[PDB]
Amino acid sequence: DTKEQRILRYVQQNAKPGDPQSVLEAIDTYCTQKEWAMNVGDAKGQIMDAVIREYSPSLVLELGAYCGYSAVRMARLLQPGARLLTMEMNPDYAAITQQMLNFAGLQDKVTILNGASQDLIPQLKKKYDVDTLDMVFLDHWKDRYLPDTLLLEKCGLLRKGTVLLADNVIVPGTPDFLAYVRGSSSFECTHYSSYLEYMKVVDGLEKAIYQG
Numbered sequence: 299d300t301k302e303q304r305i306l307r308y309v310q311q312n313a314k315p316g317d318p319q320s321v322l323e324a325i326d327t328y329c330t331q332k333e334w335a336m337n338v339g340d341a342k343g344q345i346m347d348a349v350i351r352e353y354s355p356s357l358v359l360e361l362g363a364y365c366g367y368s369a370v371r372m373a374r375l376l377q378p379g380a381r382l383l384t385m386e387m388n389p390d391y392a393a394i395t396q397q398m399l400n401f402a403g404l405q406d407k408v409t410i411l412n413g414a415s416q417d418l419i420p421q422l423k424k425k426y427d428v429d430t431l432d433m434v435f436l437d438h439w440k441d442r443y444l445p446d447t448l449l450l451e452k453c454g455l456l457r458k459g460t461v462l463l464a465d466n467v468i469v470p471g472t473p474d475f476l477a478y479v480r481g482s483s484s485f486e487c488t489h490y491s492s493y494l495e496y497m498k499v500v501d502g503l504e505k506a507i508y509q510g
């Protein structure tokens with residue numbers, strides 16, 4: 299029995315099936331009252347929601363799924379026919395994420411890509427018929443934000459206006475990524491100050507819009 303299975307179980311026992319909002323509130327309740335967990339959370343999740351509604355992306359890439367909280371957060375706001383692809387290298391986690399998506403009724407919109415982003419990113423065009431990405435949610439290991447950003451650009455997956463949205467740019471921090479995008483003329487950056495999931499530690503999201 300893992301913490302991730304206990305979270306999935308609490309959702310199955312308490313959330314309304316096919317109701318993504320109630321799945322979200324159930325994860326946040328369990329992690330606020332019983333076990334902290336690295337979901338993006340409700341405070342940063344609300345900023346995510348606002349960014350998603352602004353840009354209405356047709357194709358979203360997520361780096362790091364964990365238990366599916368953030369994929370459920372974004373997919374429930376996608377237009378009909380919009381797609382989310384989420385890369386997760388831990389097979390236990392990816393199996394929890396698939397079950398969470400199934401319970402929320404979002405299976406049709408989300409495709410789990412089992413593996414490490416650095417291996418899966420060069421296969422996006424061929425194996426998933428991707429031209430360019432409309433939005434990227436970066437929320438995996440912090441030492442990969444900058445390498446995977448450089449890899450996305452190298453593989454031709456970015457276009458003018460592609461929205462990169464990065465979690466944890468303050469805590470635990472992504473200093474090289476943050477320095478890179480803020481100093482690069484290829485990105486227009488905005489910082490959204492918030493709080494670490496289920497805590498009052500300051501954290502924030504960085505939005506970095508590729509400029510071509």
Ligand SMILES: Nc1ncnc2c1ncn2[C@@H]1O[C@H](CSCC[C@H](N)C(=O)O)[C@@H](O)[C@H]1O
Nearest residue numbers: 338362364367368386387414415437438439
């Ligand atoms: N190189 C990589 N490729 C794919 N997944 C990765 C990765 N490095 C870390 N991960 C995964 O990144 C996840 C970070 S936690 C992600 C939480 C999720 N975005 C949410 O907000 O609910 C972990 O599950 C870890 O296994």
Ligand SMILES: Cc1ccc(S(=O)(=O)c2cc(F)c(O)c3ncccc23)cc1
Nearest residue numbers: 336337338437438439465466470494495
């Ligand atoms: C098992 C485990 C627990 C905590 C951490 S972590 O690096 O502390 C961390 C904290 C956090 F708030 C986040 O949102 C995170 N998102 C993505 C990856 C790490 C995150 C890594 C692994």
Ligand SMILES: [Mg+2]
Nearest residue numbers: 338437465466
């Ligand atoms: Mg995070």
